[PDB]
Amino acid sequence: QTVLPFTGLNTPSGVAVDSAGTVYVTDHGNNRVVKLAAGSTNQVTLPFTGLNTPHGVAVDSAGTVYVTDHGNNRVVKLAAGSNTQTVLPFTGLNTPSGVAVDSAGTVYVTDHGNNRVVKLAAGSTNQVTLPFTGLNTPHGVAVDSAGTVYVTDHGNNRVVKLAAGSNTQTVLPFTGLNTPSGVAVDSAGTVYVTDHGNNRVVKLAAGSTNQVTLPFTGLNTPHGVAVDSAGTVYVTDHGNNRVVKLAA
Known part of the structure; x- marks a missing residue:
């Protein structure tokens, strides 16, 4: 387990990793989103504005960064190479937590306060509620290449x-x-879950019935998990103000 060289994190929550291995972290307690390029020792603050207790973070195939601005019941995005964030036209969100984006640009948000998951096609102004049943304060969301x-x-x-x-x-x-x-879900369909209440991360291969506990150490109320194309697993160790990773 390697601790990534982020600095000044305060109750970090969401984590995402893109195809270049850049790691994106919602620095929830500082109302900001930071990123760290692969092999770099200096994080970058993304020019989001007006965030309030942000939670989830996602990155689409064009490098646009999406953040669940939980305290403001909204989702905001920032194109790679842009200074001007745009707000997604979701309506009626309540303490939303997770965000994910698929290969068609459809954005998915766990509308945690309303026990539902909603999605918005790219450019649409009409969200739809996914037909999940019996959800209870849902947190994380991920979407794989098959949708x-x-x-x-x-x-x-x-x-x-x-x-x-x-x-x-x-x-x-x-x-x-x-x-x-x-x-999180990797390219082989293996599903990774931050078992927050047990201070651990577990994974389940596609079509397998027996989960595997990853060898992270000393996690404290961990929140987000992400996995890159090499199978390296990243976790926001929220209670310890750090992001740690395990190479395969």
Whole structure:
């Protein structure tokens, strides 16, 4: 386990990693989003403005960065190479937490306060509610290359998934979870979950029934998880104000 050379993090929450290995962190307690290029020792503050207790972070294939501005019940994005953020036209959000973006630019948000997950096609002004059932304070969301949507049903200690267009969810065969937070999915379909209440990260290969505990050490109320193209796993060790990683 390697501690990434971020500085000054305060209760960090969301984490994402893009195709170049740049790691994006929502520095929730400082109302900012920072990033660290692969192999770099100096973080960069992204020119977001007006954030308030931000939570989730995502990056799409064009390098646009999306942040759940939780305290303001909104989702904001910033194109790579741009100074001017834009606000996504979501409506009626309440303490939203996670955000994910698929290969078509569709944006998915866990509307945590309303026990629902909503999505917005790129350029649309009309969100739709995904047909999840029985969610209870959902936290994390991820979407894979097939458009399958994965959600940590935090209040119910389970992880559920919805195939693209599918009408009822599948409960993933995790076991023993406790207030799970972040979720990530790698290129092989392996699902990674921050088992926040148990201070651990677990993973489940696609179609497998037996989860595996990753060898992180000393985690304290961890929040987000991300996995890059090399299979390296990144975790926001929220209670310790750090981001740690495990190479495969």
